[PDB]
């Protein structure tokens, strides 16, 4: 028995205040995989952690015991009780699992990462490849194929609402009647798209707070359509004080607290005097109660589901499900391709017992001589080989065709019945 | 000393017949020590194939591959086609016990191409 | 309860089924029922094809069935008026063709103005009337197209969990002989349990509402795991079991 | 024609099917259609179990469908009056037929009977249909192949495509090449085929050489036609008969 | 691909005036089987001929060409044009063919012969075809099992109790056609006191017939019947007084084995009219095939003729016995076919040995050329066949299954397919 | 020495003739081999030649004639009480019956053949 299982907390089943307790950094990926394989019913393991999901891919001997051992590990790593995890856990088994990771790599599910960060991370997961056996690696490697295949055959990616994109949109959903002085803390991959999707909405000026000034200056010249000014983290609390809505994306514990915002001035009377703290950084940078302040409201990555939803984004979605369906049933075809391998080993084991017994019962009736023994042994192995070659060849099958694969497995079943390879 | 080779050689197969791989492993070691000393390529592959087989029963599959890979080397060094096919099967047998069905599959595919001739 | 609203069930029936009975009046004053293929617009108002002309009484009633796993047949009846501008005619003539893949004569296209919808759960049931507003606003169940396919897959590939759900999620007083799964929607799923005593239908709810296909499978796998841990005694069954059953006659 | 009388088809439908739509009038005067299970006596008169009441206007109409191989759906509609059996010996006669048809029991407080006055009969949807007198209906007998028709058709369509295709060349004068052909139905007089082609989709009626009375009669008749058609195409014998020309679009 | 086919003229599809031209007596059975197997697409054959049916059961290579050849043989033997046969031909294939012969042996296909004549005849066919090379094993296998079905229906269901026979219906039809004014009081006459003749008298007695005149060759035969049924008066007359008896009878039942008619128009014209109590009509009921009454004696105003075809008139709520017997037919029909499917692996068992020999021979010859001998040669040969035998024993044993168990049978056939794919035996 | 060498010559010659499809030329070879084997009074060599005769008849379609010679190797083996070639005999006979179209009878002989494969 062996099953490919995906376990974890997604954005659709668990709140951000629950997932962030399990957000495993890239540095601890080898350690997380090591611990998971320390479990009895776990052979291989992998950790996929983005701002919209926390998912654990494992190779389990028994899936009922495999899931349990992992769910406990999730509790012993998050502090969240096992009882609460089960009420928010996401769990798919086999081809539902292999499809899911394909649907993630294709950016088909939930808000997207953007600029192929989702596909880049999976490549990075594979690059971190040490002992994550050959089955999990096989699935992830094929997920990269699907991810890039969807990228090149369907530019669905060029019109998809990304996390950073929805951050800009949701900001305008809460803000009246812009402009209206936007500010972005943290200039990264997420930070870039926040400004990029901010510029495309008619934003004249944007304040960007970041550690590296060189990092910001590189962004300003790429997109010359919006005015970008730099200020360091020292004036982070100061820049937020001179902005109507603050975008926070960094890799930090929260940066803005309750009484750190209480000391801030009110926003302009042109936008209602309210401040919008949009936090797309995971774990969060704002919170966990800043919204208690009168002139300030906090929006998590979870609230990005509220907007938006407008046309071809469902046509491209169906065009990608064609790709997913094709590779998903082609990957499972490759997993079934290897099911005959243990039978081939057992057929040699059966053939050897007969070949030995008949040869041992022959030498007892024959001593002499030197070059003859090597002639009676070659005959013994000659009959067996040409007898095995038939079934042996028809147990090894690959490529596609729902007929050759179907017929090969039936051959295995017959050899099991005929030679009693079950025992 | 030449009689000591065949003596312990067939002696090792007896222990493998009665599932005692530890006492079997020791005998094939000595048999190899004699086979190399007498400088006979044919007798060398015998003890080597015996060693790998005795290791498979102890669960030492990864170690066993090394000795099953020796008989592949002895044949190439002697330009001999003897004992090669059984090696490719034996190696593939080990990978199958490791849970690795793709390498075993490739090594089994090669095993089929030799059963013809 | 744990079942979706009757207004939502009627919409779900109207989206899955394509064959209904058009009840109308005769000149003689006698009621008449004729079979007819139909389609449904975005609001839920039915669109059909007739071989007859528009008569002087326009009031009619459309009865539609939906057989579920050949065990239960929920049904509804749209009661209203039927009648024949090219504005909303070019739209409905397109939706019909998109549903059936066939051509459609625009000279025989009729629309039944929904006044109210009677909604039954099975045969020999009373049913609850539904206002034309509660019906028009209600959305069809998002698991409608995947229900039958998933139900049949569960009934063959997870029978071990279906029997197990009858031991840990419902408080029964009898031994389980056979238990198949009837249906599944956004809120949960129904089971039919057989026994030497008799046969009933139970409604087991999902932990939380399901939105898509992946969600339902994930919810089922979660319930299957807990149900397994309970029977194997790895965790307590810290919840109230389902007690409400329903008599039925096979 | 070579198809049985409409009076006989309606009897055939009433014997095979068990589910219909009861169209009735209310105190409001509105037509109301609800699903209902029914049974049929030796006369063709339907008996159903209804949970509704009353109605004080007893005028009603029972619509029953019969889907044939998922291609054509002949349907009939019994028009008449609903009333209690008589609270006597004729009630126990009905409780037995209901118990024999379904194998389930029956709540006798809910046994209503539709007094047949006249019956409508259509071959499929969107068809005009033919009225049938209650005298012709009662006298007409159900088809002797009704209980094996579906099984025998699927067996032919799955084991006998060669012969089905061959019938389209030697028994019918088609003015085109045939793409696909499935078998629709088979009754005492012959069988219907549906031919698919770029020119159109039509239904043909190929009659048996003589009337068939049983299962052995139908298979021997089919095998006889299958033999002749083979000898004609192989040109071992002449085709001395007039091919079928009449088609029907759908 | 070899299929069991039943072809012929049943009473339900062909009239007696057509079937009697193909009525083969028991004497010509070995010849008929010999001719039929002389055909190209026909291996085995057997001829079942009763007054209700003329049926030829054959084992054909092709079920299309085989039928064509047999149908032509029927035409050349009967004189009837092939086209005219095809408009009345009865034809079933394999599982339907075995189903039919059982329903006939069980007497389910109405009518019956009575007193178990159908079953007695099937035994006789098997007994006669024991020496016939044409009779094969596949046909014998079917017929022998058909007797089993007959004995099972005879013992497990008393369906034979109220079952209408040819003789029974002959009496029923006679009392039905003659005016309702004393159907029994009418003067009865029976020609030929054989098996069919005794059952006429028996059923006449069971309707209150007190007196009957019986015409027959052997008087001992009639006296043997009189001593059996004292409930009815039986008077014996020789054939010399046949017309003399018909002239004094209101209804004449004719059953004999004469190929030519016993009554022609000319003679019946000379006969007086019947009693005025029956309208002066003399009713000739003919339950013989070939008929004993001519086909134009009915042209006489004072005479009406009835054949076996006319026994269809009203041929009974105790039909549960029919369904109880159908349980037996279904039980054996779907079990006999399973037994046939059991034998499909036999050719594969043969090819697999041949495949093994080619390897075993080739490997031993390359061994012997590369090799003093004596007892060593016999030992190396033992190794050569020893490896093969123990290797084949697995697949070989799992190709052989018999003994019901539809699930094991299913797996057995899949074993064959796999051996076909793995070794390319069929290709 | 002289007669024995003559036996083995014509014996393997027939196998050469049977290897390609000329059974009529092969039947002649074993016919001599059988006659030579009988004069030499060698039961072992006699049943070898007898097997060739049967195989050759099978190639000519003369299956019923072949069974007679396959039954001879059984009689020789039973008389000499040596089980060498008995397993092949029951198999060969079943092969003949299979070609005669009598599979039920063939199956019973194969059933005996399968039981001897143990051996």
**Proportion of residues in helical segments of chain A:** 40-55%
Radius of gyration of chain C from CA coordinates: 21 Å
Strand order of the largest sheet of chain A: 7-6-5-8-9-10
How many β-strands of chain C, per DSSP? 10
PDB class: oxidoreductase
Keywords: tertiary complex, anchor protein, oxidoreductase
Assembly: hexameric
Entry title: Crystal structure of Arabidopsis glutamyl-tRNA reductase in complex with its regulatory proteins
What would you say this structure looks like, in words?
The complex is a heterohexamer, with 2 copies of chain A, 2 copies of chain B and 2 copies of chain C (250 residues). With 423 residues, chain A is α/β, with parallel strands linked by helices. Chain A has 2 domains: 1-159, Glutamyl-tRNA reductase, N-terminal domain (Beta Polymerase, domain 2, 2-Layer Sandwich), CATH 3.30.460; 160-307, 3-Layer(aba) Sandwich (Rossmann fold). In chain A, 47% of the residues lie in helices and 13% in strands. Chain A has 16 helices and 10 strands. A 6-stranded parallel beta sheet of chain A has the order 7-6-5-8-9-10. Chain A has a 4-stranded antiparallel beta sheet with strand order 2-3-1-4, with helices on both faces. The longest helix of chain A has 23 residues, at 341-363. Chain A is elongated. The two termini of chain A are 16 Å apart. Chain B is mostly helical and 117 residues long. Helix content of chain B is 81%, strand content 0%. Chain B has helices spanning 2-17, 21-37, 41-56, 61-68, 70-78, 84-97, 101-115. The relative contact order of chain B is 0.11. Chain C has 250 residues and is α+β, with helices and mostly antiparallel strands. Classes of the chains: A alpha/beta (423), B mainly alpha (117), C alpha+beta (250). Chains in contact: A-B, A-C, A-E, C-D, D-E, E-F. Chain C binds chain D through residues 19, 21, 23-25, 29-37, 49-51, 59-63, 65, 73, 75, 77, 79, 108, 118, 120, 123-127, 249-250, and chain D through 19, 21-25, 30-37, 49, 51, 59-63, 65, 73, 75, 77, 79, 104-105, 110, 120, 122, 125-128. Chain A: Keywords: Chlorophyll biosynthesis, Chloroplast, Membrane, NADP, Oxidoreductase, Plastid, Porphyrin biosynthesis, Transit peptide. Chain A: Belongs to the glutamyl-tRNA reductase family.
